[PDB]
Design a protein around this ligand. Structure first.
Ligand SMILES: [Hg+2]
Ligand SMILES: [Hg+2]
Lengths: 36, 36
């Protein structure tokens, strides 16, 4: 995921912003977070 | 996790900031992200 991108977890509504780019896929509540 | 908290994944170094608080645990590269 890229720096600055925002991801949301549709199961609990937690939203996070990427500060440092990395190669792994963001997961929350066992499900892939959705890129906003 | 709380709003404003910063999480890092030790396996790929991706860092994210919590914009909206949620009850799920943040995961990346299959592992729990570490609270900074
Ligand atoms: Hg990761
Ligand atoms: Hg979640």
């Amino acid at each position: 995921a890229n720096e600055g991108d925002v991801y949301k977890c549709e199961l609990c509504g937690q939203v996070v912003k990427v500060l440092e780019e990395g190669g792994g896929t963001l997961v929350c509540c066992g499900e892939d977070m959705v890129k906003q």
